[PDB]
Design an enzyme around this catalytic site. Structure first.
Site, PDB file in Angstrom:
ATOM      1  CG  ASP A  70       8.669  38.507  47.575  1.00  7.82           C
ATOM      2  OD1 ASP A  70       8.339  39.538  46.963  1.00  7.82           O
ATOM      3  OD2 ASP A  70       8.820  37.405  47.004  1.00  7.82           O
ATOM      4  CD  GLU A  72       5.608  43.027  46.490  1.00  2.99           C
ATOM      5  OE1 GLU A  72       5.416  41.798  46.263  1.00  2.99           O
ATOM      6  OE2 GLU A  72       6.428  43.734  45.854  1.00  2.99           O
TER       7      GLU A  72
HETATM    8  C1  LIG Z   1      11.258  35.820  38.147  1.00  2.00           C
HETATM    9  C2  LIG Z   1      10.809  37.074  38.832  1.00  2.00           C
HETATM   10  O1  LIG Z   1      11.384  37.070  40.215  1.00  2.00           O
HETATM   11  C3  LIG Z   1      11.015  38.265  40.976  1.00  2.00           C
HETATM   12  O2  LIG Z   1       9.610  38.490  41.013  1.00  2.00           O
HETATM   13  C4  LIG Z   1       8.814  37.541  41.878  1.00  2.00           C
HETATM   14  C5  LIG Z   1       8.842  38.032  43.285  1.00  2.00           C
HETATM   15  O3  LIG Z   1       8.508  36.971  44.237  1.00  2.00           O
HETATM   16  C6  LIG Z   1       7.960  39.192  43.536  1.00  2.00           C
HETATM   17  O4  LIG Z   1       8.693  40.395  43.090  1.00  2.00           O
HETATM   18  C7  LIG Z   1       6.580  39.145  42.901  1.00  2.00           C
HETATM   19  O5  LIG Z   1       6.179  40.482  42.914  1.00  2.00           O
HETATM   20  C8  LIG Z   1       4.825  41.048  42.788  1.00  2.00           C
HETATM   21  C9  LIG Z   1       3.656  40.511  43.609  1.00  2.00           C
HETATM   22  O6  LIG Z   1       3.847  39.178  44.161  1.00  2.00           O
HETATM   23  C10 LIG Z   1       2.298  40.604  42.961  1.00  2.00           C
HETATM   24  O7  LIG Z   1       1.289  40.864  43.944  1.00  2.00           O
HETATM   25  C11 LIG Z   1       2.210  41.711  41.910  1.00  2.00           C
HETATM   26  O8  LIG Z   1       0.899  41.787  41.364  1.00  2.00           O
HETATM   27  O9  LIG Z   1       3.168  41.394  40.845  1.00  2.00           O
HETATM   28  C12 LIG Z   1       4.547  41.632  41.379  1.00  2.00           C
HETATM   29  C13 LIG Z   1       5.590  41.336  40.355  1.00  2.00           C
HETATM   30  O10 LIG Z   1       5.085  40.467  39.396  1.00  2.00           O
HETATM   31  O11 LIG Z   1       6.635  38.692  41.495  1.00  2.00           O
HETATM   32  C14 LIG Z   1       7.414  37.469  41.286  1.00  2.00           C
HETATM   33  C15 LIG Z   1       6.580  36.286  41.812  1.00  2.00           C
HETATM   34  O12 LIG Z   1       5.303  36.344  41.171  1.00  2.00           O
HETATM   35  C16 LIG Z   1      11.691  39.483  40.335  1.00  2.00           C
HETATM   36  O13 LIG Z   1      11.241  40.640  41.026  1.00  2.00           O
HETATM   37  C17 LIG Z   1      11.320  39.673  38.892  1.00  2.00           C
HETATM   38  O14 LIG Z   1      12.319  40.502  38.220  1.00  2.00           O
HETATM   39  C18 LIG Z   1      10.908  38.466  38.086  1.00  2.00           C
HETATM   40  N1  LIG Z   1      11.336  38.605  36.605  1.00  2.00           N
HETATM   41  C19 LIG Z   1      12.521  38.020  36.029  1.00  2.00           C
HETATM   42  C20 LIG Z   1      12.097  37.418  34.800  1.00  2.00           C
HETATM   43  C21 LIG Z   1      11.891  38.338  33.480  1.00  2.00           C
HETATM   44  C22 LIG Z   1      11.661  37.555  32.165  1.00  2.00           C
HETATM   45  O15 LIG Z   1      11.162  38.423  31.147  1.00  2.00           O
HETATM   46  C23 LIG Z   1      12.606  39.590  33.418  1.00  2.00           C
HETATM   47  O16 LIG Z   1      11.852  40.570  32.809  1.00  2.00           O
HETATM   48  C24 LIG Z   1      13.075  40.170  34.971  1.00  2.00           C
HETATM   49  O17 LIG Z   1      13.916  41.332  34.770  1.00  2.00           O
HETATM   50  C25 LIG Z   1      13.670  39.214  35.629  1.00  2.00           C
HETATM   51  O18 LIG Z   1      14.291  39.664  36.850  1.00  2.00           O
END
Ligand SMILES: C[C@H]1O[C@H](O[C@H]2[C@H](O)[C@@H](O)[C@@H](O[C@@H]3[C@H](O)[C@@H](O)[C@H](O)O[C@@H]3CO)O[C@@H]2CO)[C@H](O)[C@@H](O)[C@H]1N[C@H]1C=C(CO)[C@@H](O)[C@H](O)[C@H]1O
Ligand SMILES: C[C@H]1O[C@H](O[C@H]2[C@H](O)[C@@H](O)[C@@H](O[C@@H]3[C@H](O)[C@@H](O)[C@H](O)O[C@@H]3CO)O[C@@H]2CO)[C@H](O)[C@@H](O)[C@H]1N[C@H]1C=C(CO)[C@@H](O)[C@H](O)[C@H]1O
Lengths: 604, 604
Positions: free
Chosen positions: A335, A372
Site C-alpha cells: 500500500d 499500488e
Molecule cells: C482514511 C482512508 O484510509 C484508507 O485510504 C488510505 C490508504 O493508505 C490508501 O488506500 C491510499 O490510497 C490511494 C493512493 O495512496 C493514492 O496514490 C491515490 O491517488 O489515492 C488513493 C486513495 O486516496 O489513500 C489513503 C492514504 O492516502 C481507506 O482506503 C480510505 O477509505 C480512507 N477514507 C476513510 C475516510 C472517509 C471520510 O470521508 C470516508 O469517505 C472512507 O469511506 C473512509 O474509509
C-alpha cells in the site's frame, strides 16, 4: 516496409548459452544488412544478423542473430538496426523509430528469470473482507460496537441488505470475515480464481484497516489469527495463492508506537522519550505531524535504522513474519508504495521498496511483491525494486478512457483505439516480457469507483473490458462482486456487500468471467504469449497473443457494427481459427464485428 | 491549438514557499479549464490553474498555478492538463500528448537545487596530457624509454612533428606534461576556457593511462605530483576549474593489487592469499580473468567490502583523496561509468556510482561528478547517481547524424532537422532544467574520430557544430586542438599532438571558438536559459534560448541558401534583434539564411 518481432518463441529461442533472436521483414526496399543492437552490462553491442534462406511466411524475410548469455545481467535488452547504404531505421516495441530508442524502451527478456514464475498462471480475486461474506458460525462477539477514536463516534453495524451510505464510511461494519472467505472458496474456485489478494486484515479500528494498530495480530472482528490460519490452510489445500495487504508507509494513530489516544504508556505521540519517537515526524515544539490530511495515518520515517529493522531489516521484521511458518503467505501487496520513505516524504523511496522486496525473497524466494501505483510505476519496475504493480497506468486508465470516457481524475476523456493502444503499448515498452506477464491488471478497486458505474449509458461495454482483462498481457484480478455486476461510485460506495442472493446477481456476466478464466487456463498464449496489436482505429482494437505455434486473436469493438479488413499478417498465417467467445466472424482476412462486442479466436 | 512553456522565468517564479507556473495558449478552441498536474512525493496532484486577465502577448492567453515547495522532494515534475467539456490534452516538453506523459518525461525543476551550480557558467577544455604541450623545462628523465609489459615491447618516443601512426598506439609518447598545460594557460584563457578535464594522469605504463598502476601518485612522465600540484595552483589562481579522469571500473594489470608481471610480492594475479584476491575475478582453478578483450585492464569487483572502502567508502578512499587538501580538485570524470559493478559485470552499478558521487560531495559539497555515457544515460541521471554525463546520446550523435551522416557505429545516417530535434528534445525531456544546463556536451573525444574528419566532403559544416556546441543547453567542452582544426580518424589517430605552429592552425575556426565563448560568457540565456526549438525541417533548425526578458535566437542551415518564415511566436515578441554571429538575416519574421551557415541573435 513492414517488420514483426515479439520477445517470445517463435521469435526467440534459448539454446546452449545463447539466445537466438529472429526478426521478420517484408517490403520492396529491404535493408541488405540488419544489426541486432543488444546490451551486455549496459554496453551497447552491434551483433550481426544473417538472412535465413527459408521464408518463415510468404513474402517475408527472416534475419537471425544471437545474444551470449554467459555474460551480462539477466535483463537482455535489444532492438534492431536496419541498415542500407545511406541510412538506418530502428525497429522497436513501438514499431519504427528514426532515431535510437530509449535504453529502457527496448525489447527485453529476463534470462535467467528470477521473478515469481507462478504469477502468470493465476487468476486473482480481490476481497475487502468486511464486505465479502459472513461466516456461517460467527460470534456476536465479532459484532460488538466500540468507539472509533479517530472518527469521533462509535462504529456502526449494518445488516447485509441495508443500503450503503456516505455516513461513517470508515466505521460501518457489515461483518464479513475470513472464515466467510473459506466457506465461499467453492464459489471462488468455480469462478476460476486461483489466488486471493486481501485488503488489510491486521488489528485496526476502521473497517478498511489501513490504520494499522498491530502488525503482528489479525483483527478479531475478521475472526482473529485462527481464522486467517484456517484461510491459509484452506487455500493451500485448494492450490490457491494468498497475498496480504502490506501497509508500511504509515501506521494507524492507535498503534502502540504512536498511541495518540493514550491507550498505553510509551507512545511516540505524547512521550518525547518514547522508543518510537524517531519513527514519526514532529514539529520543533514536539507536536506530532499529520500525514497529508490524516491524523489517523501518521507516516513512518524510514530515516530510523530501528524502524528499518522492525519492518524489513531483521529476521523478526513484519515483512518476513507473515512469509514464514506458520503463515507462509505468498507475498505482499504494498500500500502507498510510491510515497514510503524518509523525513515525511518519498525520500529514498526506491531504496526502501527494494529493501522490502529483498527481505521478502530472503524469507521466501518465490514471494510476489507488488505495489499500488495509481501513477507511472516504470522507474520502480525498471530498477526491479518490486516484481509488478497494480497496473492502473498501463491497463486500468486506458480502458477507462476508451470505454468509459473518463480517467484517474474522473475528467472527461475522448480517446480512440489508436490513442488507447499507443498508450498501452508505450507503457509495456518499458517492461521486460516476463515483467509484462506479471503486471497486476484490474478494472477497479476499493480505491476507485466501480467500472460498471463509470460506463453510465455505455454499460453494455462491460463484457468487453472483461474479455480484455483476461487477454491483455498480465495477471488478471477480479475486484470482488464485479463478476456478478456490483456497481457503485467511489469510496465508500465501491465497497458494497457482495450480493449472494442470485436474484441480485448478473448471471450472464458471471458466466462470461467463468468462460474467460477457463480460456486463460487452457491456452498458453494467454498466460505466456507475446502481444502484437494488429489493428487499432476508431472503435476497433485487434491484437493477437503469440506463443510458439499458437495464436489467440482478440477483436474488441466499442461501437456500431462494422467490418475490418485484416491485411495478411504473417502472425495470423495459421491452419485456421476456432471462435471461442463473442459473435464476431473472421473469414478471408475480414472481421465481421457486431456492435459493442469482444471476440476471441484460437488457432487450430 | 498552440502552447508555450519553458521551465524558466518568465514561465516560472519562486515566491515565498511557492513555485508559480505559467502556461501560454493560443487558438480558436481554447480549453475553459487547465489543470497543473504536478507531483508531490511521487503522488500525482491536480493543481487548478486560473486565467490571467492580461494577455502576455497578442492573441495569447496565460494560465497560472503554483506548486507548494514546503513539501515534496526537490525535483518538481509537472505537465499541463488542458480540459474541455468532453476531452483532454496534455502539454509536455515534447509538445502535445493525447495520453498522459511518462512521469520521467515531464517538465522538471530542481528547487532547491543541490547540484554544482558553477558548472553552467563554464567553458570546458579536454586535454590528453601527452599530446597537448611539452613544458619549456622538462627533464630528459621524463623522456626515458621503458618496457611496456602489457604491450610486449619498449615504449616509443616521437618528436612533435613526427606523423602519428597505428603502431604501438598505446605506447607512443610525444612528451606533453602538466607543466606544459600550466605554461599554455594564457592560450587557454584567451580561448575562453574556464575549466579543464584531463584524461588520466596517475602512474600508468601506457600513454593514455587508463591502465592505472597507482591511484595515489601522478605519473612522473607528466611531471609527477609537483607538476599537478602546480597545475592546481595555476588554475585556481586563474579562477579555472580542474576535473580529473576517474578510472574505477578497472585497474591496470601492473597495479600492485594485481601485479601480473610480478614487480612485487602480494599481487592478486599470482597469489591466492593476496589481500586483493577478492577485488578481481578468477576461474575456479584460480586463473585471473580478462576483462572484455583486455588482459591489461582487469575489472574491479565491487562485491568486496574492502574494495568499496578503498575506492569511495572510507575517508581515505581514492575518490575523496584528490578532492581535499592539497589536491582540492573540482570533481571526477568517471571512466566506464556504466559497467562498474560486481562479479565481473554491471551488477549493482547504480548503487556504486551513487556511492561514488555521494563520497565526492562528502569531501567537497560542490564537487562535479559526471560519467562517460556513449549510451543512454537517462536512468543514471533520473536516479541522480551522478550530476551529468558526457552527452554523446543527447548531443554528440544527433550532430553526427544531421551534419556528418554517421553515428556511434560509423554506420550511414540520413536524418533531417525534424528527426534531429525530436531526438535531441526527447533526450532532454528526461532531465530537469538544472540537469540540462550541466550536461557535458562535446563533438568528439579521445574515444572517437575527430568530428572534422567525420564531415568529409561537408567539412564546411564545422562552424555550425561550434555555434551549436555553445548554444544548446549544457556546458560545452572543447576537445583539445579541435579549435585550431586538428583532424584524424578514431583512436589512435584522434590523439594528434597539438599544432602550436600557427602556420598549421585554422585561425578562422579558432576565432569562432573565441567569439562563441565570449557570447556565452556575456548572455545569461546561453548559460541558464530554457530552450524552445521553433523550426526544424529539412536543412534548417531554429531554436531560442529564453531567460527572463532576454532571448538568444539560433538558426542553423546545413544546406543551400534558403528563406524560412518564422510564424509569429510569442517567444520572439521583443523590441528588436541584434545579430552577433553568422551572416543570416531576420526581418519581419523571415529568416534569410545563406548556404551552410549558423547565426546567433540577441534580443535588444
Ligand atoms: C482514511 C482512508 O484510509 C484508507 O485510504 C488510505 C490508504 O493508505 C490508501 O488506500 C491510499 O490510497 C490511494 C493512493 O495512496 C493514492 O496514490 C491515490 O491517488 O489515492 C488513493 C486513495 O486516496 O489513500 C489513503 C492514504 O492516502 C481507506 O482506503 C480510505 O477509505 C480512507 N477514507 C476513510 C475516510 C472517509 C471520510 O470521508 C470516508 O469517505 C472512507 O469511506 C473512509 O474509509
Ligand atoms: C586499451 C585501451 O585503454 C583505453 O580504453 C579503455 C578505457 O577504459 C575507455 O576509454 C573505454 O572507452 C569507451 C567506453 O567504455 C565504451 O562505452 C565505448 O563504447 O567504447 C569506448 C572505447 O572503446 O574503452 C577501453 C575499455 O573498454 C584507451 O582509451 C584506448 O586507447 C585503448 N586502446 C589501446 C590499445 C590499441 C590496440 O590496437 C590501440 O589502438 C590504442 O591506441 C591503444 O591506446
Amino acid at each position: 516496409l513492414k517488420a514483426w518481432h515479439l520477445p517470445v518463441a517463435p521469435f526467440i529461442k534459448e539454446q546452449q548459452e545463447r539466445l537466438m533472436i529472429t526478426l521478420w521483414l517484408s517490403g520492396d526496399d529491404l535493408p541488405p544488412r540488419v544489426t541486432l543492437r543488444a546490451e551486455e552490462d549496459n554496453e551497447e553491442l552491434s551483433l550481426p544478423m544473417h538472412r535465413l534462406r527459408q521464408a518463415p511466411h510468404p513474402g517475408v524475410v527472416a534475419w537471425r542473430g544471437e545474444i551470449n548469455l554467459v555474460n551480462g545481467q539477466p535483463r537482455r535488452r535489444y532492438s534492431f538496426k536496419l541498415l542500407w547504404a545511406d541510412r538506418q531505421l530502428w525497429f522497436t516495441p513501438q514499431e519504427f523509430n528514426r532515431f535510437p530508442p530509449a535504453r529502457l524502451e527496448q525489447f527485453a527478456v529476463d534470462l535467467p528469470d528470477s521473478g515469481p514464475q507462478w504469477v502468470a498462471d493465476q487468476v486473482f480475486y480481490q476481497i475487502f473482507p468486511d464486505r465479502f461474506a459472513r461466516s456461517q458460525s460467527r460470534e456476536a462477539e465479532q459484532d460488538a460496537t466500540y468507539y472509533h477514536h479517530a472518527a469521533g463516534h462509535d462504529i456502526v453495524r449494518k445488516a447485509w441488505d441495508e443500503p450503503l451510505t456516505a455516513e461513517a464510511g470508515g466505521s460501518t461494519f457489515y461483518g464479513g470475515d475470513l472464515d466467510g472467505i473459506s466457506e465461499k472458496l467453492p464459489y471462488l474456485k468455480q469462478l476460476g480464481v486461483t489466488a486471493l489478494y486481501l485488503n488489510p486484515v491486521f488489528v485496526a479500528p476502521s473497517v478498511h484497516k489501513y490504520d494499522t494498530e498491530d502488525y503482528r495480530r489479525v483483527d478479531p472482528q475478521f475472526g482473529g489469527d485462527a481464522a486467517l490460519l484456517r484461510l491459509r490452510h484452506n487455500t493451500q489445500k485448494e492450490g490457491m495463492r494468498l497475498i496480504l495487504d502490506g501497509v508500511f508507509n504509515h501506521s494507524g494513530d492507535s498503534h502502540a508506537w504512536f498511541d495518540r489516544h493514550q491507550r498505553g504508556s510509551g507512545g511516540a505521540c505524547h512521550n518525547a522519550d518514547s522508543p518510537w519517537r524517531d519513527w514519526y515526524n514532529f514539529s520543533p515544539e514536539g507536536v506530532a505531524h499529520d500525514w497529508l490530511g490524516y491524523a489517523s495515518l501518521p507516516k513512518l520515517d524510514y530515516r530510523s535504522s530501528t524502524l528499518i529493522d522492525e519492518i524489513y531489516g531483521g529476521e523478526d521484521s513484519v515483512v518476513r513474519h507473515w512469509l514464514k511458518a506458520p503463515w507462509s503467505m505468498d507475498g505482499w501487496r504494498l500500500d502507498v508504495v510510491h510515497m514510503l520513505g524518509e523525513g515525511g516524504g518519498a525520500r529514498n523511496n526506491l531504496r526502501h521498496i527494494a529493501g522490502i522486496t529483498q527481505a521478502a525473497k530472503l524469507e521466501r524466494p518465490d514471494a510476489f511483491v507488488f505495489g499500488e501505483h495509481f501513477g507511472d510505476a516504470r522507474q520502480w519496475l525498471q530498477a526491479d525494486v518490486e516484481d509488478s504493480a497494480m497496473n492502473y497506468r498501463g491497463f486500468t486508465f486506458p480502458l477507462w478512457g476508451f470505454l468509459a470516457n473518463t480517467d484517474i481524475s474522473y475528467d472527461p476523456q475522448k480517446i480512440d483505439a489508436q490513442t488507447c493502444m499507443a498508450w498501452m503499448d508505450n507503457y509495456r515498452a518499458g517492461l521486460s516480457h516476463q515483467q509484462q506477464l506479471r503486471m497486476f491488471n484490474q478494472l477497479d478497486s476499493h480505491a476507485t469507483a466501480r467500472f460498471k458505474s463509470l460506463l453510465g449509458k455505455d454499460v453494455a461495454r462491460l463484457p468487453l473490458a472483461v474479455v480484455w482483462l483476461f487477454s491483455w498481457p498480465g495477471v488478471p484480478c477480479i475486484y470482488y462482486g464485479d463478476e456478478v455486476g456490483v456497481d457503485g461510485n467511489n469510496d465508500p460506495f465501491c465497497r458494497k456487500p457482495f450480493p449472494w442472493d442470485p436474484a441480485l446477481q448478473d448471471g450472464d456476466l458471471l458466466d462470461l468471467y467463468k468462460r474467460m478464466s477457463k480460456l486463460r487456463k487452457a491456452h498458453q498464449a494467454l498466460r505466456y504469449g507475446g502481444c502484437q496489436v494488429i489493428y487499432a482505429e476508431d472503435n476497433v482494437v485487434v491484437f493477437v497473443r503469440v506463443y510458439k505455434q499458437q495464436r489467440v486473436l482478440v477483436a474488441i469493438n466499442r461501437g456500431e457494427a462494422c467490418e475490418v479488413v485484416i491485411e495478411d499478417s504473417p502472425l495470423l498465417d495459421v491452419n485456421g481459427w476456432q471462435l471461442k467467445e463473442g459473435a464476431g466472424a473472421l473469414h478471408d482476412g475480414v472481421l465481421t464485428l457486431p456492435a459493442i462486442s469482444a471476440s476471441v479466436w484460437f488457432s487450430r
